[PDB]
Design a protein around this motif. Structure first.
Motif, PDB file in Angstrom:
ATOM      1  N   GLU B 240       0.825  -1.190   0.000  1.00  0.00           N
ATOM      2  CA  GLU B 240       0.000   0.000   0.000  1.00  0.00           C
ATOM      3  C   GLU B 240       0.865   1.247   0.000  1.00  0.00           C
ATOM      4  OE1 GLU B 240      -3.321   1.585   0.085  1.00  0.00           O
ATOM      5  OE2 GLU B 240      -3.204  -0.295  -1.123  1.00  0.00           O
ATOM      6  N   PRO B 241       0.567   2.236  -0.862  1.00  0.00           N
ATOM      7  CA  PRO B 241       1.286   3.503  -0.817  1.00  0.00           C
ATOM      8  C   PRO B 241       1.114   4.142   0.558  1.00  0.00           C
ATOM      9  CG  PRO B 241      -0.196   3.426  -2.726  1.00  0.00           C
ATOM     10  CD  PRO B 241      -0.514   2.230  -1.854  1.00  0.00           C
ATOM     11  N   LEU B 242       2.225   4.620   1.117  1.00  0.00           N
ATOM     12  CA  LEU B 242       2.190   5.244   2.433  1.00  0.00           C
ATOM     13  C   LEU B 242       1.857   6.724   2.251  1.00  0.00           C
ATOM     14  CD1 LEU B 242       2.921   4.011   5.264  1.00  0.00           C
ATOM     15  CD2 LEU B 242       5.142   5.129   4.997  1.00  0.00           C
ATOM     16  N   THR B 243       0.924   7.232   3.074  1.00  0.00           N
ATOM     17  CA  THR B 243       0.483   8.620   3.090  1.00  0.00           C
ATOM     18  C   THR B 243       0.917   9.336   4.378  1.00  0.00           C
ATOM     19  OG1 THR B 243      -1.553   8.229   4.247  1.00  0.00           O
ATOM     20  CG2 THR B 243      -1.606   7.884   1.872  1.00  0.00           C
ATOM     21  N   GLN B 244       0.748  10.651   4.398  1.00  0.00           N
ATOM     22  CA  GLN B 244       1.156  11.442   5.541  1.00  0.00           C
ATOM     23  C   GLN B 244       0.225  11.143   6.724  1.00  0.00           C
ATOM     24  OE1 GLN B 244       3.982  13.252   5.981  1.00  0.00           O
ATOM     25  NE2 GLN B 244       3.274  13.599   8.064  1.00  0.00           N
ATOM     26  N   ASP B 245      -1.013  10.683   6.476  1.00  0.00           N
ATOM     27  CA  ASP B 245      -1.846  10.218   7.587  1.00  0.00           C
ATOM     28  C   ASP B 245      -1.230   9.003   8.291  1.00  0.00           C
ATOM     29  OD1 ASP B 245      -3.463  12.137   6.630  1.00  0.00           O
ATOM     30  OD2 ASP B 245      -5.298  10.950   6.603  1.00  0.00           O
ATOM     31  N   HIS B 246      -0.747   8.038   7.497  1.00  0.00           N
ATOM     32  CA  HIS B 246       0.056   6.914   7.967  1.00  0.00           C
ATOM     33  C   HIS B 246       1.257   7.378   8.806  1.00  0.00           C
ATOM     34  CE1 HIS B 246      -2.623   4.522   5.575  1.00  0.00           C
ATOM     35  NE2 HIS B 246      -1.924   4.481   4.465  1.00  0.00           N
ATOM     36  N   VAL B 247       2.067   8.307   8.277  1.00  0.00           N
ATOM     37  CA  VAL B 247       3.178   8.857   9.043  1.00  0.00           C
ATOM     38  C   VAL B 247       2.688   9.422  10.388  1.00  0.00           C
ATOM     39  CG1 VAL B 247       5.138  10.470   9.044  1.00  0.00           C
ATOM     40  CG2 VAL B 247       4.487   9.360   6.934  1.00  0.00           C
ATOM     41  N   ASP B 248       1.526  10.091  10.406  1.00  0.00           N
ATOM     42  CA  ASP B 248       0.995  10.712  11.613  1.00  0.00           C
ATOM     43  C   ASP B 248       0.633   9.639  12.639  1.00  0.00           C
ATOM     44  OD1 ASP B 248       1.143  13.237  10.444  1.00  0.00           O
ATOM     45  OD2 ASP B 248      -1.042  13.517  10.237  1.00  0.00           O
ATOM     46  N   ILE B 249       0.099   8.529  12.134  1.00  0.00           N
ATOM     47  CA  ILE B 249      -0.431   7.497  13.028  1.00  0.00           C
ATOM     48  C   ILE B 249       0.749   6.820  13.725  1.00  0.00           C
ATOM     49  CG2 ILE B 249      -1.652   5.249  12.958  1.00  0.00           C
ATOM     50  CD1 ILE B 249      -3.220   6.636  10.518  1.00  0.00           C
ATOM     51  N   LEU B 250       1.895   6.806  13.026  1.00  0.00           N
ATOM     52  CA  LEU B 250       3.096   6.172  13.556  1.00  0.00           C
ATOM     53  C   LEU B 250       3.904   7.082  14.483  1.00  0.00           C
ATOM     54  CD1 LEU B 250       4.048   4.309  10.264  1.00  0.00           C
ATOM     55  CD2 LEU B 250       3.488   3.238  12.442  1.00  0.00           C
ATOM     56  N   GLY B 251       3.500   8.345  14.616  1.00  0.00           N
ATOM     57  CA  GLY B 251       4.226   9.330  15.408  1.00  0.00           C
ATOM     58  C   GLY B 251       4.564   8.859  16.820  1.00  0.00           C
ATOM     59  N   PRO B 252       3.590   8.392  17.620  1.00  0.00           N
ATOM     60  CA  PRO B 252       3.885   7.973  18.994  1.00  0.00           C
ATOM     61  C   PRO B 252       4.945   6.889  19.076  1.00  0.00           C
ATOM     62  CG  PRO B 252       1.562   8.377  18.705  1.00  0.00           C
ATOM     63  CD  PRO B 252       2.156   8.336  17.320  1.00  0.00           C
ATOM     64  N   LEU B 253       4.925   5.965  18.108  1.00  0.00           N
ATOM     65  CA  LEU B 253       5.910   4.909  18.100  1.00  0.00           C
ATOM     66  C   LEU B 253       7.275   5.429  17.680  1.00  0.00           C
ATOM     67  CD1 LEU B 253       3.827   1.965  16.669  1.00  0.00           C
ATOM     68  CD2 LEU B 253       4.788   2.186  18.965  1.00  0.00           C
ATOM     69  N   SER B 254       7.284   6.394  16.746  1.00  0.00           N
ATOM     70  CA  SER B 254       8.491   7.105  16.368  1.00  0.00           C
ATOM     71  C   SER B 254       9.070   7.792  17.604  1.00  0.00           C
ATOM     72  CB  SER B 254       8.194   8.144  15.281  1.00  0.00           C
ATOM     73  OG  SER B 254       9.388   8.768  14.873  1.00  0.00           O
ATOM     74  N   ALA B 255       8.195   8.389  18.407  1.00  0.00           N
ATOM     75  CA  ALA B 255       8.612   9.174  19.561  1.00  0.00           C
ATOM     76  C   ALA B 255       9.202   8.274  20.646  1.00  0.00           C
ATOM     77  CB  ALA B 255       7.442   9.960  20.098  1.00  0.00           C
ATOM     78  N   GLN B 256       8.529   7.159  20.906  1.00  0.00           N
ATOM     79  CA  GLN B 256       9.013   6.243  21.929  1.00  0.00           C
ATOM     80  C   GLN B 256      10.365   5.646  21.546  1.00  0.00           C
ATOM     81  OE1 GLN B 256       6.122   3.362  22.976  1.00  0.00           O
ATOM     82  NE2 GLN B 256       7.575   2.200  24.243  1.00  0.00           N
ATOM     83  N   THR B 257      10.587   5.358  20.253  1.00  0.00           N
ATOM     84  CA  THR B 257      11.788   4.644  19.857  1.00  0.00           C
ATOM     85  C   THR B 257      12.937   5.569  19.460  1.00  0.00           C
ATOM     86  OG1 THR B 257      11.078   4.292  17.582  1.00  0.00           O
ATOM     87  CG2 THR B 257      10.427   2.622  19.219  1.00  0.00           C
ATOM     88  N   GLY B 258      12.649   6.864  19.277  1.00  0.00           N
ATOM     89  CA  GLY B 258      13.597   7.788  18.672  1.00  0.00           C
ATOM     90  C   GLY B 258      13.989   7.426  17.242  1.00  0.00           C
ATOM     91  N   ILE B 259      13.172   6.630  16.524  1.00  0.00           N
ATOM     92  CA  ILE B 259      13.456   6.318  15.128  1.00  0.00           C
ATOM     93  C   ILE B 259      12.400   7.016  14.270  1.00  0.00           C
ATOM     94  CG2 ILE B 259      13.792   4.580  13.320  1.00  0.00           C
ATOM     95  CD1 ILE B 259      14.141   2.638  15.839  1.00  0.00           C
ATOM     96  N   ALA B 260      12.849   7.988  13.464  1.00  0.00           N
ATOM     97  CA  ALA B 260      11.979   8.693  12.535  1.00  0.00           C
ATOM     98  C   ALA B 260      11.318   7.705  11.559  1.00  0.00           C
ATOM     99  CB  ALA B 260      12.792   9.756  11.816  1.00  0.00           C
ATOM    100  N   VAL B 261      10.050   7.971  11.256  1.00  0.00           N
ATOM    101  CA  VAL B 261       9.236   7.145  10.366  1.00  0.00           C
ATOM    102  C   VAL B 261       9.951   6.829   9.052  1.00  0.00           C
ATOM    103  CG1 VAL B 261       7.046   6.922   9.168  1.00  0.00           C
ATOM    104  CG2 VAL B 261       7.095   8.129  11.365  1.00  0.00           C
ATOM    105  N   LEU B 262      10.569   7.858   8.423  1.00  0.00           N
ATOM    106  CA  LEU B 262      11.249   7.643   7.161  1.00  0.00           C
ATOM    107  C   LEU B 262      12.525   6.815   7.306  1.00  0.00           C
ATOM    108  CD1 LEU B 262      10.751  11.076   5.351  1.00  0.00           C
ATOM    109  CD2 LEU B 262       9.608   8.878   4.914  1.00  0.00           C
ATOM    110  N   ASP B 263      13.258   6.920   8.431  1.00  0.00           N
ATOM    111  CA  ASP B 263      14.340   5.975   8.672  1.00  0.00           C
ATOM    112  C   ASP B 263      13.777   4.554   8.712  1.00  0.00           C
ATOM    113  OD1 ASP B 263      15.821   8.249   8.802  1.00  0.00           O
ATOM    114  OD2 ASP B 263      16.426   8.044  10.879  1.00  0.00           O
ATOM    115  N   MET B 264      12.634   4.397   9.388  1.00  0.00           N
ATOM    116  CA  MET B 264      12.053   3.069   9.460  1.00  0.00           C
ATOM    117  C   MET B 264      11.646   2.646   8.043  1.00  0.00           C
ATOM    118  SD  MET B 264      11.820   0.537  11.518  1.00  0.00           S
ATOM    119  CE  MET B 264      11.519   1.007  13.221  1.00  0.00           C
ATOM    120  N   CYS B 265      11.038   3.537   7.242  1.00  0.00           N
ATOM    121  CA  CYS B 265      10.742   3.182   5.853  1.00  0.00           C
ATOM    122  C   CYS B 265      11.960   2.728   5.056  1.00  0.00           C
ATOM    123  CB  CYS B 265      10.119   4.331   5.077  1.00  0.00           C
ATOM    124  SG  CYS B 265       8.492   4.815   5.700  1.00  0.00           S
ATOM    125  N   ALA B 266      13.143   3.333   5.298  1.00  0.00           N
ATOM    126  CA  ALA B 266      14.337   2.926   4.551  1.00  0.00           C
ATOM    127  C   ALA B 266      14.801   1.532   4.964  1.00  0.00           C
ATOM    128  CB  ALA B 266      15.441   3.925   4.760  1.00  0.00           C
TER     129      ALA B 266
END
Lengths: 306, 306
Positions: B240-266
C-alpha cells in the motif's frame, strides 16, 4: 478452510480473575470456589526479589494484609497458606462464576491459551506452547504475574500455567497451579539460563498434516524414511527425537490424509535440508511447532465448548 | 516483553451467541437487546445458494419458522426483517448478558478478533485484518456463518464483521452488522475473485517498531528515504502507498523509539529488496502486516478492558 493460531474462548477464565495487593505489590489472582491463587512473590518488594526468604517474609503478613478485589467488590480473606511458589488465600465468598475446573501439569509440547491480565483485568488472549526447555514465548509486561494458561474441554477448564517471571533473555517462566515451576526456574531475580530450545517435531508434523488438508501440498515429496534415519536428521537440526508414541498420536491425521507418518517425516527431512526456498506453508516462511495433533484435529473438525 | 498476535478476551461476545435454525439450515446469530442478527442465507437450502431470490424465499417464512436457541433456552421470535444481507429477528426477551456495543464498518488494514462459533457455541478466538481486497484470512468450517468479528474499548464491544462465505480460493468474505458486504462480494454460490492482496504498509511499520521495542534491531540500517522514493518501492512489491496520515499514526511509536518514520521506511525498503537473508523478526521469517499501530501501542503498554 484456513488455519490459524486460535485460543480457547476466554469468558470462563475472565470471571475468575481478581486483583491481589499486598503492601505496595499488585498482581493477578485466580478465584476458584472460596480460594484465591496467586504468585507468592506478591509479598515481595522490588528489593526482596534479589534474594527473598519467602517463609520469613510471610511471617510479617496477616490475612488483612492481603487485599483482594473482584471488579469493585472487596473480598474478605480469612486464611492464607503458601504452597510451593503460590499463595492460597481463603476468602469468605465462593466465586459465583466458578467453572468446572481442574489443575493439570502439562508436558513439553502441549499448548494452552494465556489470558494476559493487568490489575485483575483481562487485556488479551493468545496461544502458546510449553517448550522442551520449560519456557514459554509469551507477551507479558509488568503487572502480568498471576495471569494463567489453560485449556477447555466441553465445560471443564484445565489450568496448567501461572505466570511468574521474565528471564533476562526475555522469555517467560512460571508454575502449575500447585505452585511448582515448570523447569529449573526459581522466583528470585537472579541469572537463569533457559537451555536449548528444541523444535517440537510431532507438532511440526501435525501442522504439515494441517497444510495438506488445506491444499498446501508443494512440500510433499517422493521419498520415505525410517524413524532412525529421520532422527539422525532431527538431532542435527535440534528437533525432538520422534518416538512411536508420536507416530501413534499422528495416526488419525495419517488416516484422514492417506499420507503415512514416515512419508510425512521424509518431507520434513527435505525441508530441514533444503529450506523453504522462499515459499510459505499456511502463510509462514518457517516450520511452525506450536500446534499439537489435537490442536489440528480440533480446528479441522470444529470442536465446540460450553 | 515478547510480542504475540493477541485477541480481545471473548467473554462479552460469548454471552451473545445463539443458534438460529430455519428449515434444514443452522448457523450462528448474535443476540443484542431483543434482536437476533444473522446471515440472511439462513433461509436458503444448498440448492437455493446457487441463485437465491432472497425476497421471494423470505415470503415463504414466518416468525415461527425461525428457531432461536440460547444454550437450551428457546427464544420466541415476534418479528423479522431483512436488512441488506442480514436478517433481524425480534425476540420477546432482551439478552440479559448484552454488553455495551456499537456497529462499526471498518476500513482496510484495521484488525479485529473473530470468535469462531458452531451451532451457536464458541470454539475459538483469533485475530485477523480486513485486507485491502476486502477479504479476511480466517479459519471457518461449515456451520461457522454468523460468527462475528469485533474490537473492545474499555467496556464497549464494537462489532465490525459477520461471517457469510468462503470464496472458491478459500478466503473469507462477510458483512458489517448492517448486512453490507465488505468489498464486491455477494451471498450467492458463484465464482468470485478477490482482487490483488496488497501488503498493509503502515501495519508492517508498526510491527517493525514493535520489534525494536523488543530488542530485535538487526534490520535497522544507515539510510533514510522519502515518501515518494519509498512508495516507488512499495508499488513494485504490492505494498500500500504510504500517506502522511500513515506517518501521523506512527508518530507515537516514532517518539518512543527515537526512530523517525522515514528511517524506518528505509529499513523496510532494504528488507523488501534484500529479503531477510534467512533471519527472523519477532520470530517470523516474513514481514507481518496484521498488527495496527494501535495494536502495538496496546500490547506495548498493557491496555485493559472491563
Amino acid at each position: 478452510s484456513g488455519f490459524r493460531k486460535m485460543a480457547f474462548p476466554s469468558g470462563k477464565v475472565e470471571g475468575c480473575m481478581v486483583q491481589v495487593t499486598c503492601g505496595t505489590t499488585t498482581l493477578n489472582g485466580l478465584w476458584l470456589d472460596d480460594v484465591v491463587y496467586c504468585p507468592r512473590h506478591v509479598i515481595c518488594t522490588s528489593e526482596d526479589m534479589l534474594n527473598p526468604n519467602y517463609e520469613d517474609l510471610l511471617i510479617r503478613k496477616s490475612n488483612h494484609n492481603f487485599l483482594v478485589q473482584a471488579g469493585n467488590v472487596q473480598l474478605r480473606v480469612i486464611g492464607h497458606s503458601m504452597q510451593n511458589c503460590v499463595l492460597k488465600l481463603k476468602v469468605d465468598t465462593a466465586n459465583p462464576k466458578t467453572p468446572k475446573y481442574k489443575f493439570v501439569r502439562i508436558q513439553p509440547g502441549q499448548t494452552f491459551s494465556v489470558l494476559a491480565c493487568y490489575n485483575g483485568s483481562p487485556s488479551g488472549v493468545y496461544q502458546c506452547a510449553m517448550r522442551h526447555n520449560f519456557t514459554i514465548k509469551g507477551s507479558f509486561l509488568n503487572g502480568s504475574c498471576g495471569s494463567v494458561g489453560f485449556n477447555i474441554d466441553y465445560d471443564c477448564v484445565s489450568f496448567c500455567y501461572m505466570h511468574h517471571m521474565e528471564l533476562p533473555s526475555g522469555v517467560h517462566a512460571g508454575t502449575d497451579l500447585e505452585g511448582n515451576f515448570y523447569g529449573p526456574f526459581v522466583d528470585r531475580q537472579t541469572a537463569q539460563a533457559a537451555g536449548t530450545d528444541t523444535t517440537i517435531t510431532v507438532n511440526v508434523l501435525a501442522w504439515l498434516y494441517a497444510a495438506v488438508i488445506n491444499g498446501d501440498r508443494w512440500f510433499l515429496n517422493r521419498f520415505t524414511t525410517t524413524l532412525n534415519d529421520f532422527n539422525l536428521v532431527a538431532m542435527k537440526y535440534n528437533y525432538e527425537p520422534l518416538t512411536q508414541d508420536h507416530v501413534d498420536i499422528l495416526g488419525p491425521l495419517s488416516a484422514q490424509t492417506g499420507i503415512a507418518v514416515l512419508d510425512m517425516c521424509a518431507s520434513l527431512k527435505e525441508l530441514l535440508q533444503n529450506g523453504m526456498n522462499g515459499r510459505t506453508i499456511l502463510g509462514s516462511a518457517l516450520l511452525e511447532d506450536e500446534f499439537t495433533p489435537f490442536d489440528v484435529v480440533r480446528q479441522c473438525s470444529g470442536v465446540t465448548f460450553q
